[PDB]
Amino acid sequence: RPLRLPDGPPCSQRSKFLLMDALKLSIEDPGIPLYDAIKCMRTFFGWKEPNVVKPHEKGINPNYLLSWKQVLAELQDIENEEKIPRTKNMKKTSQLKWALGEELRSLASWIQNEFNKACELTDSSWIELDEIGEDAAPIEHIASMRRNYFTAEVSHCRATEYIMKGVYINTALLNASCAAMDDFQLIPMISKCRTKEGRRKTNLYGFIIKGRSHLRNDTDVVNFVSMEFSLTDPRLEPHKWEKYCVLEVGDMLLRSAIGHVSRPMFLYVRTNGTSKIKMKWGMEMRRCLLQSLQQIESMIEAESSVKEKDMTKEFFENKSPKGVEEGSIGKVCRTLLAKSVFNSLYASPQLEGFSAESRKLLLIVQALRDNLGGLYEAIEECLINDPWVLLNASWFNSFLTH
Numbered sequence: 001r002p003l004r005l006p007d008g009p010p011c012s013q014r015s016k017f018l019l020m021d022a023l024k025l026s027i028e029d030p031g032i033p034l035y036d037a038i039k040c041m042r043t044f045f046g047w048k049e050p051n052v053v054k055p056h057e058k059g060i061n062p063n064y065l066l067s068w069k070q071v072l073a074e075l076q077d078i079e080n081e082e083k084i085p086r087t088k089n090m091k092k093t094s095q096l097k098w099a100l101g102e103e104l105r106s107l108a109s110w111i112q113n114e115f116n117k118a119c120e121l122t123d124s125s126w127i128e129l130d131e132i133g134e135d136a137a138p139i140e141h142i143a144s145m146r147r148n149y150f151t152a153e154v155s156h157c158r159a160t161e162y163i164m165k166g167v168y169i170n171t172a173l174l175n176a177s178c179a180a181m182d183d184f185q186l187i188p189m190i191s192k193c194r195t196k197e198g199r200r201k202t203n204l205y206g207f208i209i210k211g212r213s214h215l216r217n218d219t220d221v222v223n224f225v226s227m228e229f230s231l232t233d234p235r236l237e238p239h240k241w242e243k244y245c246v247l248e249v250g251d252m253l254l255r256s257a258i259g260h261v262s263r264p265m266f267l268y269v270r271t272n273g274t275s276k277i278k279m280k281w282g283m284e285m286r287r288c289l290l291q292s293l294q295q296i297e298s299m300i301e302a303e304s305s306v307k308e309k310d311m312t313k314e315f316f317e318n319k320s321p322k323g324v325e326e327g328s329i330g331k332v333c334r335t336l337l338a339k340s341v342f343n344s345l346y347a348s349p350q351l352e353g354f355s356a357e358s359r360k361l362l363l364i365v366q367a368l369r370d371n372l373g374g375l376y377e378a379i380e381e382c383l384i385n386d387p388w389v390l391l392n393a394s395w396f397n398s399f400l401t402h
């Protein structure tokens, strides 16, 4: 019996920042977030008077518009002051006070598309060669080989960009939460990468503005407004953007498969919140790299025990198994990594419940397949509205039909 997935309106985006829909303004950098952000802004000349093109149905849309216009205005002030300050504390306007706070859903196709996008390779590297690991001593020879092979396959992976993006914004927000407790601080969303030719690049995805943050404990919430560039027209999948007000803010000139084209640039705005403990996990997202490697190392040490010989080279160079189901060893590494990253990006008690209880039903059907309710209500009580959980339930059902 397949799990019954819930009927209802399509599920909507709930990550802390854009994933496949993000857009970067970038520079080849010659280290202070706000200076880097302003230089990134200055690379774009297609800005225009912003307007709402997908309203937030439950929020105050004029306040989101006023908030983006305030960002541009206060950045314009910074540009007129002789020095550029290290940080920028927003005026406590009424639109920002409002925005900072002072049901069954069915599976939609977008979340699978997000996951496919996370597995892809980008044209830039997002981690250094020795990024993975915490070891006090030098690693032994086999451990080194395995980490180098693995890193070669995931260093350019889109899921790794999400890791580093996530690490940056969580560190910046958490640091601001105790260094500027009473300020509506403007926090640029930045990542850094290296192009195939070795050039260092600094990327701006947008900004967040934090609310008051007297975080007395791990579960105290700090609210924030995120404002994120995108080329995704929200009118194509409106259900995805239930939680957002979306602005059109510019026009960008692009190289494409039909030469130069001009496409509108959007700004995805929502209010959100996070806690000390979730920001600490966000700072730890590089462990996804380490957890994924360790799942690969289990597979290598299984083939190795059987062959009475270390199988690291034969595993990563694909030289007994007669193929790779996902098509390449590279795709297996990036698939494992994307699962770990999405578990972190989309963490929830629904995911936790689903993971524990679906594994129980897994082993039971495995033992029935090899040798021939209640647990179902436990799993299916986690199938409410979360895109990541619903997708994983959809995947589990394929593992059942097969």
Ligand SMILES: CC(=O)c1cn(Cc2ccc(F)cc2)c(C)n1
Binding pocket: 038, 041, 042, 047, 048, 049, 050, 072, 073, 075, 076, 079, 249
């Ligand atoms: C209307 C609009 O959207 C707009 C956008 N810019 C670009 C800009 C703004 C602030 C900066 F600190 C750097 C660049 C300008 C000048 N107007």
